[PDB]
Design a protein around this ligand. Structure first.
Ligand SMILES: CCCCCCCCCCCCCCCCCC(=O)OC[C@H](COP(=O)(O)OCCN)OC(=O)CCCCCCCCCCCCCCCCC
Ligand SMILES: CCCCCCCCCCCCCCCCCC(=O)OC[C@H](COP(=O)(O)OCCN)OC(=O)CCCCCCCCCCCCCCCCC
Ligand SMILES: CCCCCCCCCCCCCCCCCC(=O)OC[C@H](COP(=O)(O)OCCN)OC(=O)CCCCCCCCCCCCCCCCC
Ligand SMILES: CCCCCCCCCCCCCCCCCC(=O)OC[C@H](COP(=O)(O)OCCN)OC(=O)CCCCCCCCCCCCCCCCC
Ligand SMILES: CCCCCCCCCCCCCCCCCC(=O)OC[C@H](COP(=O)(O)OCCN)OC(=O)CCCCCCCCCCCCCCCCC
Ligand SMILES: CCCCCCCCCCCCCCCCCC(=O)OC[C@H](COP(=O)(O)OCCN)OC(=O)CCCCCCCCCCCCCCCCC
Ligand SMILES: CCCCCCCCCCCCCCCCCC(=O)OC[C@H](COP(=O)(O)OCCN)OC(=O)CCCCCCCCCCCCCCCCC
Ligand SMILES: CCCCCCCCCCCCCCCCCC(=O)OC[C@H](COP(=O)(O)OCCN)OC(=O)CCCCCCCCCCCCCCCCC
Ligand SMILES: CCCCCCCCCCCC(=O)OC[C@H](COP(=O)(O)OCC[N+](C)(C)C)OC(=O)CCCCCCCCCCC
Ligand SMILES: CCCCCCCCCCCC(=O)OC[C@H](COP(=O)(O)OCC[N+](C)(C)C)OC(=O)CCCCCCCCCCC
Ligand SMILES: CCCCCCCCCCCC(=O)OC[C@H](COP(=O)(O)OCC[N+](C)(C)C)OC(=O)CCCCCCCCCCC
Ligand SMILES: CCCCCCCCCCCC(=O)OC[C@H](COP(=O)(O)OCC[N+](C)(C)C)OC(=O)CCCCCCCCCCC
Lengths: 77, 642, 491, 90, 132
């Protein structure tokens, strides 16, 4: 109606660039390193941890069977 | 009586929040003050009925969670520990509300300020009165919510807006660990009720208890502004002075201490966590005191004093002296609130509303009533014998040596230096503001006057409580054999005897000598030999002054390294993953693949007898060839597409 | 008495609107009275149709037994068996509730063709609602993909500048993936001669075949929740689809994947679901963590809301794949709570700010509380609800989902607690910016939230608070139905 | 009125009988919810004992606390699919 | 003096998008007059591709000292406290316990601390008072 927003050319170019960053992406060595870390290295770390302790954590009502405090005090003298 | 104490402050918040337009500024402020006062009186009645008559009150509204064995109710209990926390909370909140009536009288948005201020009080009441950890978590979260709305109250100011966000996000970091601790509590015990979990502390695995309380410890550090999660504490000074007075005395800053004291039955069976709490509290006490001696903003110095005092409570917890931590917590809520109120009285008295102490000087005669409140509060803070702080703080410092372990001895020196600094920056703050030669223009001093009675009234009430309060309440919390079953102390961890008797007589007065004697040395140097403190000459002094004035460079390290890298990870994920490889393996990559393939197929469709004839004859080779060669033909076909 | 009445009434409703609006289309050059006031009398009839659809399920709700195990209201219609249990009943109610809300959102912000939009919205609501009450895989898939045709045209006609790209994304992402789910359904009909829910739940297939069936089904589900790395379609669709399309997509469609896990994976592929649980957690945890960090760098207002839904549904996937009742109930609670808060965030962003300034860039907005106080109140309240603050249904869903995850896997399931911090990081940074500092220099002062927009926000806020404070309204219905999905042999 | 569980075991039915299989699934689920109800009642005894005992809760509630921790790992909803689809004897 | 924050690229090529030197708007002079005074920006002024990391809404950047120097001081401060703590431990200068730690009767209050019989006495009892 009244165009309540004062459109800014620099903002529009900045907005358009952010929405179209895929156009200029290149699968260079820098990109490959970041892709490997987020999609392979990090999932592998969780992948190992998830199955390493899968079914090996019976924490429901786990009981204490070892005394906490020391009975006799041995002086340093 | 219990329902009136808890939800009455919520009524004041609702009345000012939604009916403040229809009743005006003045009536909105007093109705909110009325609602808090009703909670004040009801709390005092319960304090006599609970502490002295050994009675407990429990109200169960309704069930909240009923997922199989996990049952959580909207229940509130008032035991010795809860009513002990309520007295600092509701009383200081009322005095801050009474203080806020005249301090905020020139603010255009007083109705909203009191709506947020009373909402914070209600959130803290829920925190300490819930009968299970989930009800505690409800108050735990809304404490951060209300504080976020209070620090960024002046949302037109950029610094206040970003400071409120800093407090919220850091506290949400503790909330994330707090949720994880509660989930593990359900995993191990199947409940979050105090009456259920605390009855199984001695029978649970030590590793399980450690994980739950490590999550509690991380959550406590965020609220209590201990080392590693303390940057937001000084940013909280962007809010109005009544917020700072309430926040740093009997509120969010003390929430971390209460969580560990509540979990005392569990905390006694994991000594490794107690060792971490002892060192974390000891390091924060030493760091906070050193920073406060080279700080210039009057509110920053008091805020750093709050961080130093809260750590003193932590080291008491670390040595299983939950009674010591609670008593110092109650006393600290009274004289530290007085310091913030009187500091805000000095800022209002000066016409320019300066907050840097370097621009002050010679205020002692012009505002004597504010000076006396600061002077009495400072002595109470400095544990001057006979005052409330002496009976609450001096015993904790003694308890470090009385522990007679390696960690306790090291923390004793850190606490001893913290006590020495506590007197050092108090004298330095007083001298710059009241005793130094005037720095502000002469026009300020001819218009320098004390404030009205409404601002003064809470300060006088706090001043008297800062003189006699600790002496009267010492036997309740520090008396030997006093029944405080809410705080559990294992028999092997009771060191109140070796602390009281075995101490050398010199250690009983060593903090006093370093405090008063060290303060006199600083005062003499300032008055007659100020040329020593012109530290811009010496290069090492300049770096040392800059290092502590920038707060151990932790703010720079937190922002330039931790926050920037966390934002860059999102940028790397956005650029290389979301807009990157997922577009190559997505619409953009498939479009280029489709364009390449469809362009080749477009050239294969044209009317030509020789072209179609050869293809038909070529297909005859499929009949001739043995079928085991089909995959080789398939690879050959792809080669021609290229 | 449910599916028969729901389909027949809505088909009659579709015919009624078509007859009235298209009667004078014969190059009459006419004016007519139904088209007066932007076809008000045609929007009103469609709005009444949506309200009546809610009453249809309420009549069957009165006879629902929460102490009865198995499907209730079993009915034969179109050679298809239809039934309702505890889980299906609540999801149907949520879908029908969003009907009038979606229509009311685009009441007077469409350039035209309101009758086409109204019919498409009501058709989508019924088709998605029918998908919760079908009792076989084939009927599940038919309704799972039937919504694509009305939704593809709806986005391409009433969409934003990039509506063409968004229409291609939703049509192709959700079809190419669902076809892999059809392969698993076809396998069931080949080796068992039936795709009935009860029939296939009692059959144990070979461990290798269950692996193949799980992968085929999970591809269709993972794209639809959505999960990383098949999520890139969702931000594009939300940023370009109309507000009513966003409400249905965020409030109902994304919940079909969670319901799909309940019907197609847990009771029939129970053995392979246990084996796949660590893999599902790793994908969902990374989906939760990555989406929150990616949201911190977004500049489009509606895209930020779109990514927030991805992180929350990652928690839902984590909770629903936990092999305990706490995680399963929490996932269902979070789906209902997300079904109200998420549309409200789109309404605040894409329905209030966009309908006034028509720009979704974040740089144009700051300090909106100075001249839009009512807008800021709802924006702050819904921001805290979206972050899992207590007293909201999201907190109940998130806490139980996190607790159930820790019970299922104490070590890696603990990472789900990062949602408490990460969700507040991107959501509050947006809210802190929109309300802080001085009023934007690029904006002209205009009207605050109107009565119509107040109604939408209030009646989406009310269910969230009721569920948050007293979730036993939801838990009581779910307890018997959800207990059947647990697979364990304790000896 | 209060309808009672139709006690039926997976070991005494034919799964081809859809009604008998339906009862066995329901009967197993209803017995698991009784255990949860029993666990909550036993926990109520622990809560009441802890409050009234005060510093004597270790001694006064020792047997109750031991009973709660033993029942907790298995007094929960386990479903019927596990036992329906598995034969422990084999 | 001032320096750019980390992770700010020196170069970029986003097609025909204008290439300008990365500037932190937080460091701009506040006594100047701008169209957007709060953000210190004039109308139609071009934005860096990562301007969200170089504006007022970005995290505040500290430029008093370099990060390497700031981290050197931070490690030095805790390094002093680490050596001070280790010397007292290795040297063993901390005082000895003046008395035997507190003992308790009834087999070290075993029964009162959740013990059931003599098998679990050492699992729950405190330090046992051997002198009756
Ligand atoms: C699964 C198959 C994985 C194939 C990986 C292809 C990765 C890729 O697209 O390579 C990038 C290249 C485009 O060039 P560019 O982005 O500039 O990277 C060059 C960096 N110096 O792309 C190319 O060089 C064009 C070759 C693309 C080959 C695609 C063949 C796909 C056939 C199997 C589909 C499944
Ligand atoms: C917006 C408003 C929308 C309102 C919709 C929600 C209405 C809630 C339904 C009310 C049902 C009636 C009711 O309150 O139940 C009666 C009950 C007393 O009966 P009883 O079962 O014995 O409770 C004992 C519990 N141990 O009474 C109670 O137990 C209520 C106890 C409530 C606990 C104290 C109140 C907490 C909230 C304080 C603010 C509310 C009070 C001010 C009311 C005006 C402002 C809302
Ligand atoms: C884990 C590492 C952090 C990963 C989280 C993601 C990266 C940060 C994303 C948060 C969004 C940042 C933002 O909104 O702007 C920065 C904001 C501005 O506030 P500020 O610069 O402090 O202004 C103070 C003025 N006096 O500053 C903030 O409000 C951020 C507040 C801190 C965020 C807490 C994150 C955890 C902190 C503990 C980790 C470090 C432990 C040592
Ligand atoms: C916050 C992050 C989420 C929560 C992480 C929880 C990590 C704490 C785990 C503590 C624990 O596992 O307890 C055992 C711990 C180390 O194990 P260990 O000493 O080798 O064997 C002890 C067997 N009773 O033994 C100890 O208590 C001593 C070492 C504790 C380290 C604390 C730092
Ligand atoms: C779980 C999700 C977290 C995954 C951690 C991934 C860490 C990482 O990959 O950081 C990479 C980044 C260095 O990459 P970059 O700065 O682009 O190097 C070229 C500069 N011209 O380094 C960083 O951005 C700092 C990351 C440190 C926190 C990890
Ligand atoms: C009055 C005469 C009407 C026709 C009467 C009749 O016998 O038609 C059969 C059916 C009536 O029901 P009935 O015979 O009892 O058996 C159930 C089969 N639906 O009536 C019908 O089946 C008519 C159903 C017409 C509507 C079906 C359109 C399908 C909608 C799209 C599919 C969405 C779900 C997939
Ligand atoms: C915003 C914060 C969000 C959350 C941040 C991340 C925190 C959540 C994840 C951290 C882990 C939480 C606590 C999990 C450990 C609790 C279990 C435990 O008590 O540790 C010891 C236990 C071994 O018990 P034990 O009895 O000694 O085994 C004997 C077997 N015959 O079991 C173990 O051996 C310990 C298992 C290895 C430790 C795993 C922790 C590393 C996780 C890295 C995640 C990625 C970063
Ligand atoms: C802004 C949008 C508008 C939203 C704002 C308003 C939100 C209100 C949310 C209310 C949600 C409904 C909760 C009340 C419904 C009644 C619950 C109920 O079914 O009764 C349970 C309880 C005893 O159960 P029972 O014996 O089975 O009785 C059933 C008889 N038919 O019977 C009872 O004791 C009834 C108790 C009624 C309590 C009245 C409500 C008090 C306020 C909420 C209390 C929650 C605890 C305080 C939370 C504040 C934070 C600490
Ligand atoms: C306890 C042990 C003694 C510590 C107090 C000494 C007095 C003091 O710190 O003051 C002495 C000086 C300066 O004086 P100032 O207090 O900064 O006030 C004057 C304000 N000027 C400088 C703007 C005029 O400070 C320092 O740069 C000392 C090193 C800073 C950290 C404090 C000790 C760290 C080791
Ligand atoms: C549940 C089973 C339903 C199936 C049947 C639904 C009706 C079909 C259309 C016939 C009537 C018609 O074409 O009429 C057109 C109507 C009325 O729009 P209008 O604005 O008045 O038309 C414009 C004329 N003006 C400008 C003069 C006013 O719009 C529709 O097209 C709405 C219904 C179709 C939505 C989805 C289309 C794709 C369906 C794909 C199925 C897999
Ligand atoms: C197993 C999970 C499967 C999930 C879905 C799979 C990817 C879907 C991609 C969406 C494509 C789209 O939307 O088609 C529309 C896009 C338009 O491209 P645009 O956005 O306008 O930009 C590109 C245009 N330019 C450069 C001018 C700006 O045309 C294409 O790309 C055409 C090829 C699509 C083929 C998809 C077949 C998928 C096969 C099944 C999986 C192996
Ligand atoms: C950064 C530097 C911080 C201070 C370094 C302490 C060095 C040291 O020696 O600390 C040693 C201490 C003390 O325990 P301990 O001496 O190992 O055993 C003795 C065990 N008692 C004390 C029970 C008898 O434990 C720590 O480390 C504390 C945890 C790390 C806190 C950070």
């Amino acid at each position: 109606g009244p165009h309540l927003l004062r459109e800014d050319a620099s903002f529009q170019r900045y907005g358009q660039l952010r929405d179209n960053l895929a156009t200029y992406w290149k699968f260079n060595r820098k990109a490959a390193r970041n892709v490997f870390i987020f999609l392979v290295a990090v999932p592998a770390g969780l992948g190992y941890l998830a199955y390493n302790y899968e079914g090996k954590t019976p924490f429901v009502g786990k009981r204490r069977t070892e005394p906490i405090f020391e009975q006799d005090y041995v002086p340093r003298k | 009586m219990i329902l009136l104490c808890i939800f009455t402050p919520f009524l004041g918040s609702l009345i000012s929040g939604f009916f403040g337009r229809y009743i005006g500024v003045n009536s909105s402020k007093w109705i909110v003050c009325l609602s808090i006062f009703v909670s004040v009186v009801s709390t005092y009645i319960l304090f006599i009925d609970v502490i002295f008559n050994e009675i407990e009150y429990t109200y169960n509204i309704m069930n909240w969670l009923n997922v199989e064995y996990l049952v959580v109710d909207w229940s509130f209990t008032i035991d010795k520990l809860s009513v002990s926390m309520l007295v600092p909370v509701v009383t200081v909140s009322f005095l801050v509300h009474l203080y806020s009536v005249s301090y905020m009288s020139h603010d255009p948005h007083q109705q909203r300020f009191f709506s947020y201020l009373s909402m914070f009080t209600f959130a803290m009441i829920v925190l300490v009165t819930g009968d299970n950890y989930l009800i505690l978590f409800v108050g735990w979260e809304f404490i951060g919510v209300a504080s976020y709305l209070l620090i960024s109250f002046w949302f037109t100011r950029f610094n206040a807006v970003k400071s409120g966000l800093s407090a919220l996000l850091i506290n949400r970091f503790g909330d994330a660990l707090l949720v994880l601790g509660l989930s593990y509590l359900v995993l191990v015990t199947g409940s979050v009720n105090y009456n259920t979990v605390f009855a199984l502390g001695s029978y649970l695995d030590v590793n399980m208890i450690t994980v739950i309380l490590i999550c509690f410890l991380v959550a406590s550090m965020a609220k209590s502004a201990q080392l590693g999660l303390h940057s937001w504490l000084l940013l909280a000074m962007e809010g109005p002075t009544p917020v700072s007075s309430l926040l740093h005395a009997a509120c969010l800053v003390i929430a971390g201490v209460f969580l560990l004291m509540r979990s005392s039955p569990l905390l006694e069976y994991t000594p490794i966590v107690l060792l971490l709490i002892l060192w974390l509290g000891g390091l924060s006490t030493l760091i906070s005191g050193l920073i406060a001696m080279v700080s210039n903003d009057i509110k920053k110095i008091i805020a750093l004093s709050t961080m130093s005092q809260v750590g003193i409570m932590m080291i008491a917890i670390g040595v299983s002296c939950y009674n010591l931590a609670l008593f110092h917590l109650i006393c600290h809520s009274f004289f530290k609130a007085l310091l913030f109120m009187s500091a805000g009285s000095v800022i209002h008295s000066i016409i320019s509303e300066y907050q840097d102490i370097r621009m002050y000087g010679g205020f002692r005669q012009f505002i004597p009533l504010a000076y006396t409140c600061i002077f009495i509060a400072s002595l109470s803070l400095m544990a001057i014998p006979g005052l409330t702080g002496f009976y609450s703080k001096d015993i904790i410092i003694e308890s470090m040596y009385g522990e007679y372990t390696f960690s306790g001895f090291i923390i004793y020196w850190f606490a001893l230096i913290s006590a020495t600094c506590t007197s050092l920056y108090s004298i330095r703050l007083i001298y710059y503001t009241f005793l130094n030669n005037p720095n502000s223009p002469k026009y300020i001093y001819i218009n320098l006057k004390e404030n009205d009675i409404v601002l003064i009234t809470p300060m006088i009430i706090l001043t008297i409580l800062s003189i006699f309060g600790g002496y009267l309440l010492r036997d309740i919390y520090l008396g030997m054999g006093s029944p405080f079953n809410e705080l559990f102390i294992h028999p092997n961890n009771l060191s109140l005897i070796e602390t009281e008797f075995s101490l050398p007589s010199i250690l009983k007065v060593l903090p006093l000598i370093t405090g008063l004697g060290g303060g006199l040395i600083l005062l003499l140097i300032y008055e007659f030999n100020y040329s020593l403190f012109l530290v811009y000459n010496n290069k090492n002094l300049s770096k040392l002054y800059s290092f502590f004035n920038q707060k151990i460079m932790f703010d720079q390290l937190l922002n330039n390294l931790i926050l920037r890298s966390g934002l860059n990870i999102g940028w790397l994920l956005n650029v290389h993953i979301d807009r990157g490889i997922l577009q190559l393996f997505g619409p953009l990559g498939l479009w280029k693949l489709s364009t390449f393939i469809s362009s080749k197929l477009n050239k294969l469709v044209f009317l030509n007898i020789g072209f179609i004839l050869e293809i038909i004859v070529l297909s005859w080779l499929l009949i001739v060839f043995k079928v085991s060669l089909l995959k080789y033909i398939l690879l050959l076909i792809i080669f021609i597409i290229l | 008495m449910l599916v028969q009445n729901l389909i027949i009434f809505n088909i009659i409703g579709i015919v009624l609107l078509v007859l009235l609006n298209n009667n004078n289309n014969g190059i009459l050059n006419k004016k007519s009275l139904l088209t007066i006031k932007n076809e008000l009398k045609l929007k009103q009839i469609g709005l009444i149709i949506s309200i009546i659809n809610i009453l249809i399920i309420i009549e069957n709700w009165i006879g629902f037994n929460s102490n009865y195990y198995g499907f209730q209201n079993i009915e034969r219609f179109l050679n298809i068996y239809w039934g309702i249990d505890g889980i299906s009943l609540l999801l149907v109610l949520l879908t029908l509730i969003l009907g009038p809300i979606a229509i009311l959102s685009n009441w007077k912000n469409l350039k035209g063709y309101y009758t086409y939009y109204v019919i498409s919205i009501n058709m989508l609501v019924i088709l998605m609602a029918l998908n919760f009450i079908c009792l076989d895989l084939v009927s599940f898939y038919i309704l799972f993909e039937s919504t694509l045709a009305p939704l593809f045209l709806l986005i391409g006609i009433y969409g934003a500048n990039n509506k063409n790209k968004a229409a291609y994304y939703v049509l192709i992402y959700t079809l190419a993936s669902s076809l892999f789910m059809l392969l698993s359904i076809v396998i069931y009909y080949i080796i068992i001669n039936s795709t009935d829910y009860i029939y296939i739940n009692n059959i144990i297939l070979s461990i290798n075949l269950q692996s193949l069936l799980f992968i085929g089904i999970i591809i269709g589900i993972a794209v639809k929740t959505p999960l990383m790395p098949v999520h890139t379609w969702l931000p594009t669709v939300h940023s370009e689809s109309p507000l009513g399309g966003s409400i249905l997509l965020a409030g109902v469609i994304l919940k079909l994947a969670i319901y799909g896990v309940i019907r197609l994976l847990l009771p029939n592929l129970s053995e392979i679901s246990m084996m796949f649980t660590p893999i599902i957690y790793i994908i969902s945890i990374l989906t939760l963590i990555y989406s929150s960090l990616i949201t911190l760098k977004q500049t489009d207002l509606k895209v930020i809301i779109a990514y927030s839904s991805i992180s929350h549904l990652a928690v839902c996937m984590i909770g629903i794949f936990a092999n305990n009742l706490i995680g399963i109930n929490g996932s269902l609670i979070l789906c209902l709570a997300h079904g109200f808060v998420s549309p409200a965030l789109f309404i605040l962003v894409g329905g209030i700010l966009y309908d006034r300034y028509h720009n979704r860039l974040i740089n144009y907005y700051q300090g909106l509380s100075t001249f839009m106080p009512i807008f800021s109140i709802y924006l702050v309240v819904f921001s805290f609800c979206n972050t899992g603050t207590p007293l909201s249904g999201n907190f109940v869903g998130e806490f139980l989902s996190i607790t159930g995850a820790v019970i299922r896997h104490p070590i890696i399931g603990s990472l789900t607690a990062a949602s408490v911090l990460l969700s507040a990081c991107y959501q509050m940074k947006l809210t802190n910016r929109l309300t802080g500092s001085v009023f934007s220099q690029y904006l002209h002062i205009t009207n605050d939230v109107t009565n119509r927009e107040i109604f939408l926000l209030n009646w989406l806020l009310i269910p969230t608070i009721i569920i948050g404070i007293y979730p036993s309204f939801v838990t009581n219905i779910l307890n018997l139905a959800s207990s059947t999905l647990i697979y364990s042999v304790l000896i | 009125d209060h309808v009672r569980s139709p006690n039926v075991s997976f070991d005494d039915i034919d799964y081809n009988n859809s009604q008998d299989l339906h009862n066995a699934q329901e009967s197993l689920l209803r017995e698991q919810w009784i255990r949860v109800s029993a666990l909550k009642v036993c926990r109520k005894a622990l809560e009441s004992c802890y409050k009234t005992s005060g510093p004597n809760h270790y001694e006064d509630c020792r047997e109750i606390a031991e009973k709660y921790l033993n029942m907790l790992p298995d007094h929960r909803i386990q479903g019927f699919l596990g036992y329906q689809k598995n034969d422990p004897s084999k | 003096k001032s320096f750019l924050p980390h992770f700010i690229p020196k170069n970029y090529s986003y097609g025909d998008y204008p290439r300008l030197k990365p500037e932190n708007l937080q460091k701009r002079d506040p006594y100047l007059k701008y169209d957007d005074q709060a953000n210190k920006r004039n109308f139609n002024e071009p934005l860096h591709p990562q301007q969200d990391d170089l504006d007022m809404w970005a995290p505040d950047h500290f430029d008093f000292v370099q990060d390497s120097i700031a981290l050197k001081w931070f490690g030095t401060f805790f390094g002093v406290l680490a050596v001070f703590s280790s010397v007292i431990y290795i040297g063993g200068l901390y005082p000895e316990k003046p008395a035997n730690p507190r003992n308790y009767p009834f087999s070290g209050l075993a029964k009162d601390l959740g013990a059931s019989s003599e098998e679990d006495t050492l699992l729950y009892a405190a330090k046992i008072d051997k002198s009756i």
